[PDB]
Amino acid sequence: EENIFVMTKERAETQDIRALKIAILNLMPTKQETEAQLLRLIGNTPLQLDVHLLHMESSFYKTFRDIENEKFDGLIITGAPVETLSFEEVDYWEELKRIMEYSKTNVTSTLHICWGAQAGLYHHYGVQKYPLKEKMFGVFEHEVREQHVKLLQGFDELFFAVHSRHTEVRESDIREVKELTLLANSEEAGVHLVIGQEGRQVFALGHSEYSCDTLKQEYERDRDKGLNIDVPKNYFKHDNPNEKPLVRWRSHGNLLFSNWLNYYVYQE
Amino acid sequence: EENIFVMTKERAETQDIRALKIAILNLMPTKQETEAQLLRLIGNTPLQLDVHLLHMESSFYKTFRDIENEKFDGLIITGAPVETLSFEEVDYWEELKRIMEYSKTNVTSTLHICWGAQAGLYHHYGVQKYPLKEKMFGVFEHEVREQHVKLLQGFDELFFAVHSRHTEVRESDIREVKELTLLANSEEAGVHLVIGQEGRQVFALGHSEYSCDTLKQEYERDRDKGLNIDVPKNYFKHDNPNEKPLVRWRSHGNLLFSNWLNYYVYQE
Ligand SMILES: N[C@@H](CCO)C(=O)O
Numbered sequence: 001e002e003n004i005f006v007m008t009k010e011r012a013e014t015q016d017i018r019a020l021k022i023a024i025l026n027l028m029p030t031k032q033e034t035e036a037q038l039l040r041l042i043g044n045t046p047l048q049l050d051v052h053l054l055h056m057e058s059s060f061y062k063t064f065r066d067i068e069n070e071k072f073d074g075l076i077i078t079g080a081p082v083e084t085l086s087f088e089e090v091d092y093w094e095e096l097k098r099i100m101e102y103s104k105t106n107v108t109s110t111l112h113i114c115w116g117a118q119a120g121l122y123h124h125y126g127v128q129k130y131p132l133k134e135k136m137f138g139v140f141e142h143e144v145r146e147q148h149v150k151l152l153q154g155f156d157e158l159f160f161a162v163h164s165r166h167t168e169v170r171e172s173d174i175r176e177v178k179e180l181t182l183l184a185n186s187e188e189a190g191v192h193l194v195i196g197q198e199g200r201q202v203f204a205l206g207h208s209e210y211s212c213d214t215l216k217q218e219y220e221r222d223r224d225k226g227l228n229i230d231v232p233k234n235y236f237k238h239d240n241p242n243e244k245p246l247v248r249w250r251s252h253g254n255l256l257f258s259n260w261l262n263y264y265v266y267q268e
Numbered sequence: 269e270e271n272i273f274v275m276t277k278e279r280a281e282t283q284d285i286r287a288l289k290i291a292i293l294n295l296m297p298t299k300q301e302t303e304a305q306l307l308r309l310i311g312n313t314p315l316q317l318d319v320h321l322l323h324m325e326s327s328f329y330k331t332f333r334d335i336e337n338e339k340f341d342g343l344i345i346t347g348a349p350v351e352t353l354s355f356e357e358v359d360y361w362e363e364l365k366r367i368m369e370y371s372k373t374n375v376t377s378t379l380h381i382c383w384g385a386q387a388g389l390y391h392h393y394g395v396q397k398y399p400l401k402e403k404m405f406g407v408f409e410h411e412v413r414e415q416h417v418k419l420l421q422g423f424d425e426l427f428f429a430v431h432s433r434h435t436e437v438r439e440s441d442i443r444e445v446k447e448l449t450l451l452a453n454s455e456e457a458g459v460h461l462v463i464g465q466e467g468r469q470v471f472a473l474g475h476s477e478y479s480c481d482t483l484k485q486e487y488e489r490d491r492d493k494g495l496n497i498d499v500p501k502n503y504f505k506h507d508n509p510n511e512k513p514l515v516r517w518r519s520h521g522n523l524l525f526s527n528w529l530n531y532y533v534y535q536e
């Protein structure tokens with residue numbers, strides 16, 4: 001043949017796509033570390049991102065009153081050190097309710113992490129949280145529970161994710177809610193990924209955003225306070241806190257945030 | 269503050285980057301399946317790709333004589349059903365040597381898969397291959413052996429990859445060669461990822477490109493021939509060949525090919 005065709009994987013043209021507006025509601029004690037972790041994970045996209053930092057009304061950080069008349073493509077509500085309290089006892093609960101209500105109409109997709117996810121599940125869907133006898137603490141194997149869901153694109157069928165919490169939501173309580181879909185659970189750790197209203201809410205009860213040493217630092221922090229805390233599970237080789245942490249969860253941390261931004265925050 | 273700054277993750281502008289020239293040398297028996305697997309994995313890049321299909325000189329497919337006076341950014345040399353033979357006994361060995369010599373000067377980065385990797389290791393670096401008593405056959409855990417190497421960017425420290433072979437190269441034989449670096453090995457399966465001359469060659473002795481059912485089909489193919497073949501390891505739940513294959517390796521299949529294209533095939 002005189003003319004032999006080549007197969008061309010076309011250039012992914014994303015340069016004329018509008019920059020996405022993302023807000024981060026930072027509720028974590030380690031404000032710096034949490035922000036840094038999230039900014040790096042949010043970097044996993046070819047699209048341009050305008051990232052607005054928020055915190056509770058209780059100089060880069062804004063409050064809800066500054067954005068209440070605006071719309072966002074994405075919002076991240078982080079975890080918080082308040083899990084043992086009833087939701088209504090948390091000092092900023094009324095303000096958070098305002099933000100969560102706002103997210104329904106003014107945010108395309110809200111990602112909720114750990115307690116933020118518990119708060120969202122409770123406020124939107126009435127899902128209760130329950131105390132654990134000991135901390136769920138370590139890196140755990142999870143299984144994909146739904147095929148063909150964009151949030152899970154490129155995921156292995158079995159993958160690892162960190163959990164760090166003295167409370168839980170229960171699978172049966174998620175299952176009974178029509179508007180929720182369980183995406184990933186762990187035989188040991190329980191519920192991890194849940195989607196609400198086709199992606200209007202994304203709930204991650206585990207800590208996929210944790211970097212290498214986060215569980216180590218939590219372990220040492222608690223140990224030093226005189227708390228009775230076991231070594232994080234599947235994290236130190238031979239359960240030796242002096243060894244380098246084994247990182248089994250970063251690839252799916254990246255995939256979670258990348259798929260969220262590309263398939264849920266962005267809408268064509 | 270009157271003006272609150274936002275943090276902007278800049279748009280990744282790749283639209284003005286030249287389309288990369290990739291050639292695939294297809295030596296596999298399952299020509300269609302292998303090509304399809306590779307085309308999908310090569311899709312993991314925002315860059316445009318011009319993919320030229322090659323096969324041995326023994327209507328999309330070209331031969332070496334068509335491209336001998338051209339340069340490529342990337343070349344993939346697949347596996348082949350010839351592993352029990354001494355390299356020089358393979359019918360097209362002299363022609364493959366010509367292609368491998370050509371790759372040194374005319375190809376920025378060549379990725380070699382399974383036997384192709386054995387052939388490349390042998391021709392370029394004198395690394396011998398050795399028979400196994402039984403097929404290395406299944407999905408195996410691997411550990412990252414180098415930090416800060418671009419081919420392994422975003423990899424978990426422990427990750428899974430399929431192997432399917434009745435022969436091996438040995439780690440000690442790779443170790444003694446200065447121009448080679450072991451990137452990933454498996455306690456059970458042995459050598460998987462190796463880099464030659466800072467990325468001029470990439471060797472993948474396992475089969476990261478395998479899709480869901482490939483090991484299943486190989487198992488049934490061999491079984492039907494009357495061969496004595498054990499179930500692929502860590503692949504069927506309860507080692508039951510009727511169960512759906514568990515896919516633990518796709519995420520790092522994607523990462524391997526994505527990092528190869530983005531950091532080795534492409535050069536700024
Ligand atoms: N579990 C975290 C709180 C956020 O989940 C900690 O121990 O600091």
Ligand SMILES: N[C@@H](CCO)C(=O)O
Nearest residue numbers: 347348382432433486
């Ligand atoms: N192991 C493959 C050959 C390519 O490695 C097979 O059994 O068909």
